[PDB]
C-alpha cells in the first residue's frame, strides 16, 4: 500500500502547485475546510515515501574523483 500512496501524494502535490488544492467549501450552513501543508515539506514527504518504497533508484552515492 505504498504505490497508491505515492500516486495520491504526487497528484496532490501537482494540483496544489497548479491550482487545485481546495481549502474551504461552503454550502450556506454546511461548510468545512482543511489545513494546508507547505510545498517544501510535501516535497520531502514525497521523496521519503518514494525512497522507502520499492520504486527505482533516484540517488547515487557521493562522487568519485580522479586526475
Amino acid at each position: 500500500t505504498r504505490q497508491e500512496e505515492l500516486a495520491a501524494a504526487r497528484a496532490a502535490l501537482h494540483d496544489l502547485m497548479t491550482g487545485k488544492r481546495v481549502a474551504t467549501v461552503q454550502k450556506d450552513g454546511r461548510r468545512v475546510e482543511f489545513t494546508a501543508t507547505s510545498v517544501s515539506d510535501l516535497k520531502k514527504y514525497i521523496a521519503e515515501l518514494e525512497v522507502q518504497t520499492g520504486m527505482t533508484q533516484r540517488r547515487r552515492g557521493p562522487a568519485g574523483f580522479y586526475v
Partner: protein
C-alpha cells in the same frame, strides 16, 4: 470554453463541492432511465396545521444537481437516493453552473393532463 472568465471558476467550484459534499443518487425511469449522479441532498422539515389540529409534518427534499447531467429530466419520472426512492416534483432554472432538483416521496400522482 465560455466567454465568462467567471463561470469556469463557478463550474470548478461546483464540481469540487459535489465531490466533497453530498451523495451518489441513481435515477430510475424517464428518458435518463438508469443513471448515477453526484449531488448534495438536504431535507428541511415543514409542517402545516390546516384545521384545528392537522399536523402533517413533512420534508422538502432538494438535491442541487448540475443541469448538464439532468437535461430534459421531465417531471413524471422517479429518482432513487441509494436505498430510498423519490420523484422529481420540480427543477429550478440554472444559476450559471447547476440548478436545484426538488423531490417528493412515494410515487408521482397520476398525470392528469388530457
Amino acid at each position: 470554453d465560455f466567454d465568462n472568465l467567471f463561470d469556469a471558476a463557478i463550474a470548478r467550484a461546483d464540481e469540487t463541492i459535489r465531490g466533497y459534499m453530498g451523495t451518489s443518487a441513481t435515477i430510475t425511469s424517464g428518458e435518463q432511465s438508469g443513471a448515477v449522479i453526484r449531488g448534495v441532498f438536504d431535507d428541511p422539515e415543514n409542517i402545516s396545521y390546516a384545521g384545528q389540529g392537522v399536523r402533517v409534518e413533512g420534508s422538502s427534499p432538494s438535491l442541487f444537481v448540475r443541469t448538464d447531467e439532468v437535461r430534459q429530466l421531465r417531471r413524471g419520472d422517479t429518482l432513487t437516493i441509494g436505498e430510498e426512492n423519490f420523484w422529481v416534483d420540480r427543477v429550478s432554472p440554472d444559476d450559471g453552473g447547476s440548478c436545484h432538483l426538488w423531490l417528493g416521496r412515494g410515487v408521482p400522482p397520476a398525470v392528469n393532463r388530457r
